[PDB]
Amino acid sequence: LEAIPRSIPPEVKFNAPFVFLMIEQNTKSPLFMGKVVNPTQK
Amino acid sequence: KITPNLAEFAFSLYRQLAHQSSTNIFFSPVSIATAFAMLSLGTKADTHDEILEGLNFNLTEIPEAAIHEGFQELLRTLNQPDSQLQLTTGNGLFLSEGLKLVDKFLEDVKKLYHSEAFTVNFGDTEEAKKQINDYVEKGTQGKIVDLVKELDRDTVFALVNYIFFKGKWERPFEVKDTEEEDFHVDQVTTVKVPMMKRLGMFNIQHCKKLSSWVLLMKYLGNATAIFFLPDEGKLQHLENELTHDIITKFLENDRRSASLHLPKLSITGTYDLKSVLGQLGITKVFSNGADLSGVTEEAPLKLSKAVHKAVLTIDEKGTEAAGAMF
């Protein structure tokens, strides 16, 4: 097995209030949208 | 042709819900839109324009004749998934047994909105409730159970609508990698949450306009998820700065190696859209001045309320979401 040096990629963590939406690729319309403020909140 | 109108409607409505609460937010723009766009068919005068306009439509420019014509194609299209993707939307019209509809109205909703019609007896509020809740439960494959819990006894007609979505990540997460991590709610409030992890190539990029990081996860099929991660103290900004086109740009993009941490979610939103929609101009239809002549010439009518419920599930396999309007 041949080993070569790596690269340590950067960490992208969504561990804070974030926004998001879901789009249908054809119509490019917003199926869903929302904001996650606290995933534990019910 | 109306995608931009919706896109912006979603944002309009969103900014309202974001202002009203801090709580997790989740709703289905398409769902709320087609439900009201459909109602307008049997609405007249201001109550009519008021609706259409609140959905971010400029009556002068794009004629209603073409607005409805558009919802027709948008619906027909959202219903032909890329096989690997499950996406469905149904519109049902429940009429009280003793009701004299207005032919045109039934032909329209059924034609422009692919609507179904049924004849329940609202006198038996338990059975009528059972029929509707069942329709929605079936359509949303169990995701949205008892949508209707309190139904008026004098209810003349209910205009139900549902949307179902189930897709798989085009590049899923391994369950063995998911660990419990910290999630920062406040600058002094942290909660433990099962964090999904995956190292690889992502469509992540940092849009400067929104001062946030934009991540794009494709779904096997014809759907894509967009996650906006705001830079320290810029969430309020991100929210206000969102526009259709900005979302159109990101999609034209590239790729990059990164180690992603995305929490798995199980959240649901329930809304009484009367307060919020009024804020967008839609008030007539909810008042004792609402004109629903288009539905029935019988007695005058009005909306007693507008309930919306959406439910989201995001795991390593992909995403499942349902939305229902009642």
Locate the domains of chain B by residue range.
1-169+264-324, 170-263
Fold of the CATH domain B1-169+264-324: Antithrombin; Chain I, domain 2 (3.30.497)
Q: Which residues contact A22 (CB under 8 A, 6 or more apart)?
A: A30, A31, A32, A33, B165, B223, B224, B225, B226, B319, B321
User: Strands A18-24, B223-230: parallel, antiparallel or unpaired by DSSP?
Assistant: antiparallel
Q: Which residues contact B252 (CB under 8 A, 6 or more apart)?
A: none
Q: How far apart are CA A23 and CA A26, in angstroms?
A: 9
What CATH architecture does domain A1-42 belong to? Ribbon (2.10)
Which residue of B lies nearest to A29 if distances are taken between CA atoms?
B3
Instruction: Determine the residue type at B307.
Output: V
B223 and A11: CB-CB below 8 Å?
A: no
Q: Residue B165: CA atoms inside 13 Å, Cβ hemisphere, count?
A: 33
A21 and B235: CB-CB below 8 Å?
A: no
Resolution for the entry shown, Å: 2.6
Experimental method of this PDB entry: X-ray
Closest partner CB to A34 (pick from B26, B78, B215): B26
- CB-CB neighbors (< 8 A) of B215 in chain A: 12, 14
Distance to chain B for A1, nearest Cα, Å: 22
Residues of A with CB under 8 A from a CB of B: 7, 9-41
Q: Which of A18, A41, A42 to mutate to test the interface with B (most CBs of B within 10 A)?
A: A18
Q: How far apart are CA B8 and CA B111, in angstroms?
A: 26
- CB-CB neighbors (< 8 A) of A31 in chain B: 28-30, 78, 87, 163, 165, 223, 321
For B172-196, b where at least 16 C-beta lie within 10 A, e where not — what string?
ebeeeebeebebebeeeeeeebbbb
Closest partner CB to A15 (pick from B29, B183, B212): B183
| Phi-psi group of A27: left, alpha or beta (phi > 0 → left; psi -120 to 50 → alpha; rest → beta) | alpha
Cβ proximity of B307 and B130 under 8 Å: no
Which residue of A lies nearest to B186 if distances are taken between CA atoms?
A16
Sign (positive or negative) of CA dihedral B65, B68, B74, B80:
negative
For B222-245, b where at least 16 C-beta lie within 10 A, e where not — what string?
bbbbbbbbbeeeebeebbeebebe
Query: Cβ of B118: how many Cβ atoms within 10 Å?
Result: 14
B258 and A12: CB-CB below 8 Å?
A: yes
Closest partner CB to A14 (pick from B10, B26, B227): B227
Distance to chain B for A40, nearest Cα, Å: 7
- CB-CB neighbors (< 8 A) of A19 in chain B: 212, 227-228, 230, 235, 238-239, 242
Query: Cβ of A8: how many Cβ atoms within 10 Å?
Result: 8
Cα-based distances in Å from B81 to B28, B167, B168, B219 = 18, 10, 13, 11
| Phi-psi group of B191: left, alpha or beta (phi > 0 → left; psi -120 to 50 → alpha; rest → beta) | beta
* Structure-token match 């419920």, residue found: B309
Q: How far apart are CA A14 and CA B260, in angstroms?
A: 8
Residues of chain A by 3-state class (helix, strand, coil), percent to 5:
0, 45, 55
Strand order in the sheet with B157-168: B116-120, B86-96, B157-168, B318-325, B307-314, B265-272
Instruction: Return the structure tokens found at B162.
Output: 């549902």
For B253-291, b where at least 16 C-beta lie within 10 A, e where not — what string?
eeeeebebbbbbbebbbebebbebbbbbebbbbbeeebb
Q: How far apart are CA B251 and CA A30, in angstroms?
A: 13
| Phi-psi group of B13: left, alpha or beta (phi > 0 → left; psi -120 to 50 → alpha; rest → beta) | alpha
Cα angle value B306/A36/B51 (rounded, 5°): 25
Closest partner CB to B3 (pick from A10, A28, A35): A28
Three-state DSSP state, B208: coil
Instruction: Determine the residue type at B92.
Output: G
Query: What's the CATH code, domain B170-263?
Result: 2.30.39.10
Domain ranges of chain A: 1-42
Altogether, the residues listed in chain A come to a count of: 42
Q: Which residues contact B58 (CB under 8 A, 6 or more apart)?
A: none
A33 and B191: CB-CB below 8 Å?
A: no
